[PDB]
């Protein structure tokens, strides 16, 4: 799983600093 791959993830911390979240 990833922060931008389906299911994307932008709620955690290590995933916030990601162009696919901020």
Swiss-Prot record:
The modification Alanine amide is found at residue 22. Disulfide bonds join 3-15, 4-20, 10-21. Coiled coil: none annotated. Hydroxylated; hydroxylations improve the ability to block Nav1.4/SCN4A sodium channels but does not affect folding. It comes from the Eukaryota. Changing residue 8 to Q: Important decrease in activity on Nav channel from eel electric membranes, and decrease in binding to rat Nav1.4/SCN4A by increasing the rate of dissociation from rat Nav1.4/SCN4A channel and potently decreasing the rate of association. It is found in: Secreted. Expressed by the venom duct. The record marks 13 as: Important for binding sodium channel. The modification 4-hydroxyproline is found at residues 6-7, 17. The cysteine framework is III (CC-C-C-CC). Mu-conotoxins block voltage-gated sodium channels (Nav). This toxin potently blocks rat Nav1.4/SCN4A (IC(50)= 19-110 nM). It also moderately blocks rNav1.1/SCN1A (Kd=260 nM), rNav1.2/SCN2A (IC(50)=2.7-17.8 uM), and mNav1.6/SCN8A (IC(50)=680 nM). The inhibition is reversible. In vivo, induces paralysis to an isolated skeletal muscle preparation from frog (cutaneous pectoralis) within a few minutes. Belongs to the conotoxin M superfamily. Negative results: does not or only weakly blocks rNav1.3/SCN3A, rNav1.5/SCN5A, rNav1.7/SCN9A (IC(50)=6.0 uM and >100 uM), and rNav1.8/SCN10A. This is Mu-conotoxin GIIIA. It comes from Conus geographus. The chain holds residues 52 to 73 of 75 of the full protein.
């Amino acid at each position: 799983r990833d922060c931008c791959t389906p299911p994307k993830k932008c709620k955690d911390a290590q995933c916030k600093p990601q162009r696919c979240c901020a």
